[PDB]
Amino acid sequence: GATLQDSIGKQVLVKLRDSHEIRGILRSFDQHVNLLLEDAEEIIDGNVYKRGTMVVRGENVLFISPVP
Template sequence: MSSDMSKCLATLGATLQDSIGKRVLVKLRDGYEIRGILKSFDQHVNLLLEDAEEVVDNNIFKRGTMVVRGENVLFVSPT
């Protein structure tokens, strides 16, 4: 693995670690947006969210606890 890739992964991990226990917005490849409290993540960027809500056309649908598979994640942002 290149040095630049290692730095990128380290930054990603640190950023996600700082977001544990906080509300985040997750944008998925299929256009869905999920908001929830980030409880944990792994090296594949699989995310465990609590109090998750799906946002569709400014409508909010409560989803509860969700696991979001990392391969579907475009970005994760604090809300």
């Protein structure tokens, strides 16, 4: 919350269950850690795949960290 609030408009790293790695601009989030990201991208086997708008279910989120 605190942190997520401070990260609105910032790029965040998100990892999910089943070894998924995503980066995106955090636009919104809720208490269930559901997320709306913009200019989102998946990092798969070292390759970047741009996705654009992405909504993420919080149930599978492992962690979120604003990119330095």
